[PDB]
Structures are given as structure tokens and as C-alpha cells.
Design a binder for this molecule. Structure first.
Ligand code: MD1
Ligand code: MGD
Ligand code: SF4
Ligand code: SF4
Ligand code: SF4
Ligand code: SF4
Ligand code: F3S
Ligand code: MO
Lengths: 895, 329
């Protein structure tokens, strides 16, 4: 043979298929937590394919992150040329939801929105206009477009961290932080991992390799899931309790650890509140105001065994830090101003057990006890493994062995997710998970801690994002609490009686007293609704109440989208947004510590524009709608703000400095300590790692782990107690029976026999990629809902039959997948398919209402206060109970 | 047929495959975007146990007995699954009422039985089995082709069907026991996995390997003693070929799953048996899996005591280049 074989000439047919003339950096801007670096391959102006760039600089002795990516990302270019893409601005001509449109120019569509927006400010209020755009870390420039737009005209923004249920509500109650977790690389540093309500084989695909590689490196993994999920096939131990009974498993594990003295007593004396003295008369924390005249209500006492005297613990809410700092968004207070080693235990020896007598100003001595003492007495009585065995269905010896193993391995770490966070009582549940972590003393250690993983919810450079989104101040911006917002305007019946839990009482008292917001104010209806980067209608719990009650209240609903989703299908105007491979935007996550981005592979296709350029184009139309309607300046007394709508475009661009997409992206990086020094060109070449983080110092070659400013540097925790606070002595917490971590049985207000589960599927990123044709051919052609054969057999249900689920809130008809791994008495429908998919009626949200836990409404207890996505009602939905019936209107034979 | 100077070899780690179907999409979005290729998944992942893609391909026929060639069945199109098609534009843009249902009525699909497996709760068991063209040392397709259209390269051992010499005899589809050649009814030709030879000629791993998100795919030449493929197959001997009773000798290998919980007794306490039955790993890979599971089990116990185990370090692959031909592109 010469130098090329017999067939080298023809084989160029295959060599030409893997060819290109252009490669650019691309990212997929969906709420996925992936944020995986990709390259985009174009030829002749047509994007041909995408592939992971695999260019994350690895960390020493730990596996690298690459390739990352997933099955949805490797066909993300289908949304450039697929049948779902919005090409032109569309104006509804039929009824909402029919898909009957007329093509319109940008001018006509942007004038119509400008005409209605200026009308709403004039005749009603600016807070009757609102913009919903979720998770800014996914696309911070696109997030900032509509928010800066609403920022200057007076519209109110939304929350999403809690509305989705991603917000670790139990972590903000305990630690006083918005929410933090270690990056997934530190999963390799662990010896004992508990996958607790988390299915990372499907829900953490680009990061799931660290778990198996850890087990191949000596570690052990436990899976706590009622169903034998995809991830369970690799763990060493599988615990399957009844749905929602995990709190009884956690408290029984605390009992064993506390009974058998397995806990880290020193870590408990230094970093917790279990040594704080609680009065046996009022069940309250003993305070300095109770004992000393002019004493603080936000200062407390522990009993020091070294001196036999009570000592005021240092760094609580009443203790000020000499030289203050600016408020930090993800903290209840800025405890970083305190000096290093401030809460170092030193020579102190706080007593965890015992009874003591303290005497107050009023003359009377009162018996006080530490939090650890009251908790221990209740654990030994209520939370024995035998009693948890009868509640959870897990044997007492399996519960005991799990606790002994969790306390013995170092480091041990809990990885929780939606399976444990989307319940009505998930706050007290995560408090139980933080107690187990506090007992073992693994918080702040590589391979340990209580780690939560949800949506793409950590924009590390929040300061630069704040600058682009809310330039004149986050305190000069209106926010609604979207869980409250939906609940009220959609007139939801949550089926919970007022004599059991008076939700309306807790909700209204929280609002009229300023603890939680309710917009529009004065009881006005919402009138204008901007939806982009989120499928709000399709993902909204209480969806049937929303369609019937809230949706008619809106006069104009605008959807800016790359495709026609369910929200856009039921909208009044749909504007085409540019694909991810046609725009410039940043993209980060909490799963890894790098800044990813996307850049235009080609120009925006058809008449589409980028989100940043759309709101800039609308800003000039509103500038002229106000001119025409003679309403250019108006006084917004809430902020003493004489707004100028005639100069909206200059305020959107800082007099033109931020008129282009890359400029606003550079502005975000330039105004945050995590990213200053990084430019767009650096990110265009190679994914750059953050320069700092949130609750710990970022270290070269070491995976990040949170809370090390408090557990290592000994700065106070941003809680009322200054520590990891497990005793929450608020009236509303006593009313619910959760002043301490305990078991709260799930809600059974839906009088129906099947618990309704709706986990996240590996076959989509929420509603995105649900209608992807390749994804559907990788399943059974449409949505799915799973039953155990022990339930489908007495009902006459066969595999792939149509089944009918319903409660008092609505009804869904969907094809069933009978699965032996499914646990009897519960049904799992993969969450929120698009309404127009293979569903005979409604969707997964039709059977779900909106429910509000009163503990999530507290806004007057130290670190418990409303801040957008820091505290507020969680949008739980795992308590939903439905019935199942075989739909006999269509029974196709199989062959 | 001639023997190749080098034989490209794959190793799939069933202890790490998460079944996320990324390899399936990367292959389809690169090679099978052409006319008549909509139903063809050269790279496919399926749940074991299960019927696979196409349905019941393990009872199909092909490969070898007694040195003798068998002609199995040509799987009908329903066994591969009719690719579901949709009328989105009618509902979304053209005001046509009615859900966007799939056509035809769903009765079969490449991944129809995902995570159904076998065994009753709480002992249900399944795992994922990524399949592809085995690029066998004794390719039964090449042997059956009466036009000699198929050929095995001398440079890297890849088997490719020459699309100009192929006349649509479908004998390769009869005699392949893995059902990896697919007859294109629009070109009247057979299409098959090409082993990513345009990428390997440039020194880039195959797409299914390079884009493997679970970090479970291994690639290389078995003549190279520094390749993890060599160490897993030849040195530590934990990688086995799929269905060796077919007599074709595949060049893609599998490490049986050693991770997984144990069978749960009726009292909730664990026994010695894993949830994955050995009888099933035997049916897929023969009699050697019990010895291989012991080597893997033994070496993992070393790591659990904080000790060293080079076999584990090969499976872990802290650096991707220790796993495959350079995946950067
Ligand atoms: N019963 C039950 N209910 C549940 C859940 C459950 O577990 N159980 N899960 C929750 C949770 S946690 C979440 S995070 C929601 O599903 C999130 O849905 P979301 O609407 O934010 O994204 P999604 O992927 O759905 O849609 C994003 C939209 O934005 C489009 N898009 C994506 N990128 C862009 C862009 O760059 N620009 C613009 N203008 N649009 C873009 C996207 O096409 C889609 O329409 C909520 N419901
Ligand atoms: N491909 C893809 N990946 C994703 C997402 C996506 O949409 N698509 N969503 C991302 C985001 S926004 C989210 S919030 C996360 C969610 O992803 P996850 O953290 O995995 O949460 P879930 O999928 O809802 O449930 C996880 C498992 O816990 C089980 N479970 C249900 N109830 C309980 C319970 O009461 N106790 C216990 N111990 N287990 C229970 C569930 O059946 C499930 O098997 O994943 C993220 N990853
Ligand atoms: S989809 Fe989410 S995970 Fe899959 S690639 Fe795009 S970003 Fe990474
Ligand atoms: S990509 Fe790697 S992990 Fe995901 S399926 Fe293909 S092989 Fe298994
Ligand atoms: S796998 Fe089937 S097709 Fe590929 S070579 Fe071996 S026999 Fe021929
Ligand atoms: S190697 Fe190349 S061709 Fe063979 S399957 Fe993986 S991707 Fe498709
Ligand atoms: S037998 Fe040969 S002729 Fe083509 S259809 Fe098969 S390669
Ligand atoms: Mo989420």
C-alpha cells in the first residue's frame, strides 16, 4: 500500500460530516445546574452540532469535571431549527391558549405593550405591572434586562428560590444564610455520603461521576428514597421509608447518636445554640433583658462549667461588631465585620445538660435548662428507633446502624434534594439534617457538611448582578412574594381547614404588619405580566386556580421566548428571543466554581433579538408612549422617586455605556469581588474560576465547602443567637409545634389514597426539552406517570394504559409506566410536561394547590425576615394526594 | 479479511454508566442525521434486564456456531420502533385543537423499558448497557456480505460498510448477532457505526467515548501497554466482551457492576447477594464474571481501608487522558 489505503477516497463522505469552518463558546441557559462549557460548530452559517469543550482546569488528586454535559445539551441546537421556535412577534387573535396568532412587526408589538404599560401606571399603579424572570445565575444579563426595565418604571419583581421549593428553608432558619453548598468535586473528599431525597443519576448528570468514583476510592453511599430510583443501583445501602416520614428517621438517628454519646461535644459547645439557656416558665430563651436592667433582648446566656457561672455568649443579634460592614444579600446580617476568632470557645466550657436556677430583675428565681437538655429529654421519650420504625417502615436496627455509621465515618456528608425539600414540613426536616451534621461536627470540612442541591441558584458574583439589575438600590425596588402572590390572586383553595392550621390568619397578619409583601398594594389586581426565561404558567402550582382565577385578571401577558411554551401559548403577545448560540451572556452555578458563558455562533435568527436588546428596544417605545400620552414623569411616593419615563433608554444603558450585550456582561464582572479582573475574552478562551466565594475562602486546587467563615474563622453565624440555632422560640414556631427539630407528619388534607410524587426526569430540563422529538423517542412518545404493580393490578391497569389522577384541585390523564421500583401507595409523575403534550387533560400541576407553611411567613425574628429569595413561603407539593383510575375511553392493544 | 496493524478497543465501565443517554445523542447528532437514518441509533443504551434495541435482539440470530455462519432474522421496523413524529406547528401556531400526540400509537421504542428491570420490591434490579458496533475481530457482517461491501480497516481495526459497494443485500443484518447494522429503506443500503474513524485519524476519541458524561467509557489500542483499555482487559482482566458465545470476538469490553446494594431479606436485613443477580451477568458475559467480581470486590475493599489499589485508580480516571485518546476538540 502506498500511503493511503484502498478506500481513503470514498471515506471523505464521513470526514466531511465532522467538519466545520467556525468554533465558538456556547452555553445552555436553562435552570439545570450544569453550566457546562461547550463548543459550537458551524459550517456555511448553519450550526451543525455542539460538544463539551472539556476545558475545566482540574484540581490535584481529585477527578476532573470534564466532559460534563448531558443528553439535553448535546442536542440543544434543535431549538435553533426546530418546529417550536418563535420567528416573529405574535399577537393573539383567538382566545388565550388556542395558538391562533397574527404575525406582527416589532414596532406594532412593542407599541402595544408600551401603550398598555403606560396606561397601567396612569390609571392604576406601577405595581400592577410585574416581570417574572427566574434564577439569574443561568443568564445574568438576560435576567437584568427586564428587571432593570421594571426597576425604573416601578413594576415589581418576583421570587423563585422559594416559589420553586429550591430554597433550603430549614437552612435559613438554622444558619441565617440564604443557602450554600459545596461544589460537587468535594463529594470525592467524603467517606460516607447519604443521598437523601436526591436522584443525581437523573438530576445531577454532569456531576454524578464523583459519587461512583468516590466509592471506587473507598467511600460509601446511602440512598434514602421510597422508590428504587436510578441512583440507588450504585449505592451500598438503600433505605426506603414511607413518603414524607424522613423527619422521624432523622430524629431517631439523633437519638442513637446522642444516647450512645457519638457526637462532637466541642463543636456543639462552640458553633451551636444547644448550650443556650431556656427558661422552664415561658419556654423562651433566657435573655439579658430578663435578668439585667437595660439588658438586651437579643443577648442570652449559657452556663459555663469552668466557672460555675452563667456567661453571655458572644456574637448574637444584640452584639454589634464595633466597625460595621455593608449588608450582605445572602446573610441575615453582615457578621464578616467581626474580627477573626471572635466566637472561639477558648477556655469556656458551656454545659449541654443539667438544670440551673437564675434570678431575674423581678425578684423570682426561674429554673433554666440548655437547649441540648430539653431536646435530649424529648428524643429519649419520643424519637426511639422502635417508634420511628412504626412511622417510617424502616427497622429500628437499620435505623440504629445507619446512625452509628453516619457518626463514625469521617468525614460524613448529607446530600439532600427535592425529595426532602418539596414537602410542607421540609423546613423542620432540613433542621433535622443540620442537627445530624452539627452532632457529627462535619460542617466546614472537606467531605462533610449538610449539602443541598436544587436549581442553578447561586450567583456568586451577586454584587455585580445587583449593579446591572437594580442600579439605584435593592431597597428602591418592589418585590412580591410569588408564593403569596399566586396563592392570593389565584384564589387558591388549599383544602386545609382553619381550625387545624388557620392559613388565612397567619398569612394576613404577616402582611398587614409588614413581615411579608402583598403586591399590588391596596388590593388592586395585577394587570400586566412579563414572562421570560421561565415557564411560569406551566410550572405554577395551583395551576387550575391560576387559569380560572388569576389569568383572567391580567389584561396584557407578554412572553419573550425562544420557543412556544405553555405560558406563551396562553399569552397575549409572544416575542421571539435569540437562541443560546445566538447571544452573549454569562452562565454559572453552585455545582462548580467556574464562570461559563455563551457567545453568538451566528446572528439572531429570523426577527429574534436578545433579551437585553428587546427591553432596550421596548424602552424607546415606552419613552414615546409616555410622550404621546403626556405622562412622562410621575411621582412614586414609595421611594420618593420622580420617575422619568421619557429618558428610560439612557437609564437602561447608563447613557449608552451598556447598550450592547457584551458591555452589560463586563459590567457584572467588574462590580463583584468574585470576578473582577476576569474579562469576556478570558471566558471566551477558557472557563475562569471565581476569585472568591460566599461563606468560605476559595483555595487553589481545593474544592469549595461552605460556612468556613464561622466554623474555622470563628465569625458569628448571622442568626439571632449568633450560632447554628436549633431553638426558634417564636410564637408561630410554638404554634406549629416546631420550636425544636421534631417529626411533623405530612399533610393529609387531600382525602385521597395515593401520595402524589413528581420528581425531575433525566429526559428534560424542566419544561425545556420536554417537547424535544429526540427526547420523546428516547421514552414512550410523551409524558409518563409511574405506579407499582401492586396498585395497578387491582385497578385493571396495564403498562402504557391511560390512567386518571385527580383530587379536589384538578385532574390529569396520562399514560402509565408500571415500575417494580415504585413503592405501593404512591404514584410518581415526572414533573410539569407541557400542556400540549400527550396528555388527555390538564397536567401534573392540576392536582396541586398552593400551600403556605406559617413558619415560612415569619418576618420579625432576628434573621427571619423577608428578603427576595432569602425567606418566604415555599412552594411545596409533595404532600399532594390523588386517586388513580383506568381511563377506558381509549384502551389500545399492544403488540 | 486480513488482520489490522492496530485494533481500536473500547472498555465500558458498568459501575459508572448513569444511563443518561448522552453518548446516544452525540452519535445521532453527528452521524445519523441523514435520510432514512431517523430510526437508527448506532450508539444506544438500554436497561438490563430488558428487551433492548431492537426488541428481543438477543434471540435474533447471527454470529457463529461451530465455525459455521448463522443467518438470523431481519428485525421488522416495529422492533426498532417507528420514530415518533409530531404536529407541533398545528397546535402551537396554527390554532389546531388537540394535544400534540405521537404518531404512531406508542407500542415500541429503543428505550421503551427504561428502569423496569426484574424482581419485585424491595429487590427490583436493573442497570444500563451501552451498546454499539463491536468492531469484532471476526465480523459476521463482513463475512455475510455477498458484495464484499463491508471491510475491516488495516490501520485501526474499525469495521465500515462501503456505501458505494453496498447493494442492499441485508445479509449483514441477518448475520450480525448484535443487530447493529441497519438497513436504510430510502437509500436501499446498510448503515452502521463507523467507529469515529475521522475523529481517531486526527487523534480524538470517539464521540460516545469523548462525550461520555458518566466518565465510564474507555478507548485505545490494546497493543499499547499504557492504555487503561490494556490494563483492564489484559493486565487486571476485569473487562469482558458482550455475548462471547456468538463466536465473533468483540473488541468492546465491559467491567461488570460491582457497586450496588444487597438483596434485602424479608426482615429488612441485608444478605450476601447483590440486587443484581449473578445469573444475569453470567447470561451476558459468561462464566468469568464471578472471578472478575471478586477481583473488583477485593480491590475496592483495599480502598475502603485507606489502602492503595491501582485497578481502582484506572476505573476512577482522575484525568480523562488516562482513559482515552485525547477528547479535546
Ligand atoms: N409538582 C411539582 N411541581 C414542580 C416541581 C416539582 O418538583 N413538582 N419543580 C419546581 C421547580 S424546583 C422548578 S426549578 C421549576 O420547574 C422551574 O421551571 P422554569 O419555568 O423556571 O424553567 P423551564 O425550563 O420550565 O422554562 C424556561 C423557559 O424559558 C425559555 N428560555 C430559555 N432560555 C431563554 C433565554 O435565553 N431567553 C428567553 N427569553 N427565554 C429562554 C425556555 O425556552 C423556556 O420557555 C416547579 N414545579
Ligand atoms: N435532567 C434534569 N436534571 C435536574 C432538573 C430537571 O428538571 N431535569 N431539575 C434540577 C433542579 S431545579 C432540582 S429542584 C433538582 C431536583 O432533583 P432531586 O434533588 O433529585 O429531587 P427529586 O427528583 O424531586 O426527588 C429525588 C428522589 O427523592 C424521592 N422522594 C420523593 N419524596 C421523598 C421523601 O419524602 N423522602 C425521601 N427520602 N425521598 C423522596 C423521589 O422519588 C426521588 O427519587 O434537580 C436538578 N437536576
Ligand atoms: S443542559 Fe444543563 S447540563 Fe446538559 S449541558 Fe446544557 S447545561 Fe450542562
Ligand atoms: S454517556 Fe457515559 S454514562 Fe451516559 S450513557 Fe453513554 S456511557 Fe453510560
Ligand atoms: S458488531 Fe455486528 S456489525 Fe459490528 S462487526 Fe461485529 S458483527 Fe459486524
Ligand atoms: S463510536 Fe462514533 S460511531 Fe461508533 S457509536 Fe460511538 S459515536 Fe456512533
Ligand atoms: S449484506 Fe452487504 S450488500 Fe449491503 S445490505 Fe449488507 S452490506
Ligand atoms: Mo428547582
Amino acid at each position: 500500500i502506498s500511503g493511503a489505503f484502498e478506500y481513503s477516497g470514498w471515506e471523505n463522505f464521513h470526514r466531511t460530516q465532522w467538519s466545520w469552518d467556525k468554533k465558538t463558546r456556547g452555553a445552555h441557559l436553562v435552570n439545570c445546574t450544569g453550566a457546562c462549557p461547550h463548543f459550537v460548530y458551524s459550517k456555511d452559517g448553519v450550526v451543525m452540532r455542539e460538544e463539551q469543550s472539556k476545558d475545566i482546569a482540574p484540581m490535584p488528586n481529585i477527578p476532573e469535571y470534564n466532559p460534563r454535559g448531558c443528553n439535553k445539551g448535546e442536542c440543544g441546537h434543535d431549538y435553533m431549527y426546530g418546529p417550536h421556535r418563535i420567528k416573529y412577534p405574535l399577537i393573539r387573535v383567538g382566545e388565550r391558549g388556542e395558538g391562533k396568532w397574527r404575525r406582527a412587526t416589532w414596532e406594532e408589538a412593542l407599541d402595544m405593550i408600551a401603550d398598555k404599560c403606560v396606561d397601567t401606571i396612569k390609571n392604576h399603579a406601577p405595581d400592577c405591572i410585574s416581570v417574572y424572570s427566574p434564577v439569574p445565575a443561568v443568564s445574568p444579563v438576560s435576567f437584568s434586562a427586564g428587571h432593570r426595565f421594571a426597576h425604573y418604571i416601578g413594576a415589581h419583581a418576583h421570587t423563585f428560590y422559594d416559589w420553586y421549593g429550591d430554597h433550603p428553608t430549614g437552612q435559613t432558619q438554622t444558619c441565617g444564610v440564604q443557602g450554600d453548598t459545596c461544589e460537587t468535586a468535594d463529594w470525592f473528599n467524603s467517606k460516607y455520603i447519604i443521598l437523601w431525597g436526591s436522584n443525581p443519576t437523573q438530576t445531577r448528570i454532569p456531576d454524578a461521576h464523583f459519587l461512583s468514583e468516590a466509592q471506587l476510592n473507598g467511600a460509601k453511599i446511602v440512598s434514602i428514597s421510597p422508590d428504587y430510583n436510578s441512583s440507588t443501583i450504585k449505592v451500598d445501602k438503600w433505605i426506603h421509608p414511607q413518603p414524607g416520614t424522613d423527619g422521624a428517621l432523622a430524629m431517631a438517628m439523633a437519638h442513637v447518636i446522642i444516647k450512645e454519646k457519638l457526637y462532637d461535644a466541642h463543636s456543639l459547645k462552640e458553633q451551636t445554640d444547644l448550650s443556650y439557656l431556656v427558661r422552664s416558665d415561658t419556654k423562651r430563651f433566657l435573655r439579658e433583658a430578663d435578668v439585667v436592667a437595660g439588658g438586651s433582648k437579643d443577648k442570652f446566656y449559657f452556663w459555663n462549667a469552668k466557672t460555675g457561672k452563667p456567661v453571655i455568649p458572644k456574637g448574637s443579634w444584640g452584639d454589634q461588631p464595633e466597625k460595621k460592614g455593608s449588608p450582605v444579600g445572602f446573610l441575615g446580617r453582615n457578621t464578616f465585620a467581626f474580627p477573626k476568632g471572635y466566637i472561639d470557645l477558648g477556655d469556656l466550657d458551656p454545659a449541654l445538660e443539667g438544670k440551673f436556677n437564675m434570678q431575674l430583675l423581678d425578684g423570682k428565681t426561674v429554673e433554666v435548662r440548655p437547649v441540648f437538655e430539653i431536646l435530649k429529654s424529648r428524643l429519649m421519650a419520643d424519637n426511639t428507633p422502635e417508634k420511628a420504625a412504626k412511622i417510617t417502615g424502616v427497622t429500628a436496627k437499620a435505623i440504629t446502624e445507619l446512625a452509628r455509621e453516619f457518626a463514625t465515618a469521617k468525614p460524613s456528608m448529607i446530600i439532600c434534594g427535592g425529595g426532602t425539600q418539596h414537602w410542607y414540613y421540609s423546613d423542620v426536616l432540613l433542621r433535622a439534617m443540620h442537627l445530624l451534621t452539627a452532632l457529627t461536627g462535619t460542617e466546614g470540612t472537606n467531605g462533610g457538611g449538610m449539602n443541598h442541591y436544587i436549581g442553578q441558584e447561586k450567583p456568586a458574583f451577586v454584587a455585580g448582578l445587583v449593579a446591572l439589575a437594580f442600579p439605584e438600590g435593592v431597597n428602591k425596588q418592589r418585590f412580591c412574594q410569588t408564593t403569596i402572590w399566586t396563592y392570593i390572586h389565584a384564589e387558591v383553595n388549599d383544602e386545609i381547614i382553619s381550625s387545624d392550621i388557620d392559613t388565612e390568619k397567619y398569612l394576613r397578619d404577616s402582611i398587614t404588619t409588614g413581615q411579608m409583601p402583598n403586591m399590588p398594594e391596596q388590593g388592586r389586581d395585577p394587570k400586566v405580566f412579563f414572562v421570560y426565561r421561565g415557564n411560569w404558567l406551566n410550572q405554577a402550582k395551583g395551576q387550575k386556580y391560576v387559569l380560572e382565577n388569576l389569568w383572567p385578571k391580567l389584561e396584557l401577558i407578554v412572553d419573550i421566548n425562544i420557543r412556544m411554551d405553555s405560558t406563551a401559548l396562553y399569552s397575549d403577545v409572544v416575542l421571539p428571543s435569540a437562541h443560546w448560540y445566538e447571544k452573549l451572556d454569562l452562565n454559572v452555578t453552585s455545582e462548580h466554581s467556574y464562570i461559563n458563558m455563551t457567545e453568538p455562533a451566528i446572528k439572531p435568527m429570523w426577527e429574534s433579538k436578545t433579551d437585553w436588546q428587546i427591553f432596550l428596544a421596548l424602552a424607546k417605545r415606552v419613552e414615546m408612549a409616555a410622550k404621546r400620552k403626556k405622562y412622562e414623569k410621575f411621582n412614586d411616593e414609595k421611594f420618593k422617586w420622580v420617575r422619568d419615563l421619557s429618558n428610560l433608554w439612557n437609564q437602561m444603558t447608563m447613557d449608552g455605556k451598556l447598550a450592547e450585550d457584551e458591555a452589560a456582561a463586563q459590567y457584572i464582572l467588574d462590580n463583584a469581588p468574585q470576578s473582577k479582573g476576569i474579562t469576556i475574552q478570558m471566558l471566551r478562551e477558557k472557563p475562569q474560576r471565581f476569585k472568591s466565594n460566599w461563606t468560605s475562602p476559595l483555595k487553589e486546587g481545593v474544592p469549595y465547602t461552605p460556612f468556613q467563615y464561622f466554623v474555622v474563622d470563628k465569625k458569628p453565624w448571622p442568626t439571632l443567637t449568633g450560632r447554628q440555632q436549633f431553638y426558634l422560640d417564636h410564637d408561630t414556631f410554638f404554634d406549629m409545634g416546631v420550636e425544636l427539630p421534631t417529626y411533623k407528619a405530612p399533610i393529609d388534607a387531600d382525602k385521597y389514597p395515593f401520595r402524589f410524587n413528581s420528581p425531575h426526569s433525566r429526559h428534560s430540563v424542566h419544561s425545556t426539552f420536554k417537547d424535544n422529538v429526540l427526547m420523546l423517542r428516547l421514552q414512550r412518545g410523551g409524558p409518563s406517570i409511574e405506579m407499582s404493580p401492586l396498585d395497578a393490578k387491582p385497578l385493571g391497569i396495564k403498562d402504557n394504559d391511560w390512567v386518571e389522577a385527580w383530587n379536589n384541585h384538578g385532574k390529569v390523564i396520562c399514560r402509565v409506566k408500571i415500575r417494580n421500583g415504585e413503592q405501593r401507595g404512591r404514584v410518581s409523575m415526572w414533573h410539569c410536561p407541557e400542556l400540549y403534550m400527550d396528555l388527555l387533560t390538564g397536567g401534573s400541576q392540576s392536582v396541586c394547590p398552593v400551600r403556605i407553611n406559617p413558619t415560612n411567613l415569619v418576618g420579625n425574628y432576628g434573621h427571619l425576615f423577608f428578603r427576595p429569595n432569602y425567606y418566604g413561603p415555599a412552594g411545596s407539593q409533595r404532600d399532594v394526594r390523588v386517586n388513580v383510575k383506568r381511563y377506558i375511553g381509549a384502551t389500545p392493544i399492544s403488540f | 479479511m486480513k488482520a489490522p496493524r492496530r485494533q481500536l478497543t473500547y472498555v465500558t465501565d458498568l459501575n459508572k454508566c448513569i444511563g443518561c443517554q448522552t453518548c446516544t445523542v452525540a452519535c445521532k447528532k453527528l452521524w445519523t442525521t441523514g435520510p432514512g437514518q431517523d430510526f437508527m441509533y448506532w450508539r444506544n443504551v438500554e436497561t438490563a434486564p430488558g428487551l433492548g434495541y431492537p426488541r428481543n435482539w438477543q434471540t435474533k440470530g447471527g454470529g457463529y456456531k461451530n465455525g459455521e455462519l448463522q443467518k438470523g432474522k431481519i428485525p421488522p421496523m416495529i422492533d426498532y420502533g417507528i420514530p415518533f413524529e409530531f404536529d407541533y406547528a398545528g397546535r402551537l401556531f396554527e390554532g389546531k385543537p388537540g394535544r400534540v400526540r405521537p404518531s404512531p400509537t406508542p407500542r415500541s421504542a429503543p428505550n421503551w423499558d427504561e428502569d423496569q428491570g426484574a424482581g419485585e420490591y424491595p429487590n427490583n434490579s436493573f442497570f444500563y448497557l451501552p451498546r454499539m458496533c463491536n468492531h469484532c475481530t471476526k465480523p459476521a457482517c463482513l463475512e455475510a456480505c455477498p458484495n464484499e461491501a463491508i471491510y475491516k480497516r488495516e490501520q485501526d481495526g474499525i469495521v465500515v460498510i462501503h456505501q458505494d459497494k453496498c447493494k442492499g443485500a441485508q445479509a449483514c443484518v441477518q448475520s450480525c448477532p448484535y443487530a447493529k447494522p441497519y438497513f436504510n429503506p430510502l437509500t436501499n443500503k446498510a448503515n452502521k457505526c463507523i467507529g469515529c474513524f475521522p475523529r481517531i485519524e486526527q487523534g480524538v476519541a470517539p464521540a460516545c467515548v469523548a462525550q461520555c458524561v458518566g466518565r465510564a467509557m474507555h478507548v485505545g489500542f490494546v497493543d499499547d501497554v499504557n492504555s487503561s483499555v490494556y490494563k483492564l482487559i489484559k493486565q487486571y482482566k476485569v473487562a469482558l466482551p458482550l455475548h462471547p458465545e456468538f463466536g465473533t470476538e468483540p473488541n468492546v469490553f465491559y467491567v461488570p457492576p460491582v457497586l450496588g446494594p444487597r438483596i434485602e431479606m424479608a426482615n429488612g436485613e441485608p444478605s450476601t447477594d447483590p440486587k443484581i443477580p449473578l445469573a444475569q451477568l453470567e447470561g451476558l458475559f459468561g462464566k468469568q464474571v464471578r472471578d472478575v467480581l471478586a477481583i473488583l470486590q477485593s480491590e475496592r475493599e483495599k480502598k475502603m481501608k485507606g489502602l492503595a489499589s491501582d485497578l481502582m485508580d484506572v476505573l476512577i480516571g482522575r484525568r480523562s487522558t488516562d482513559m482515552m485518546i485525547s477528547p479535546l476538540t
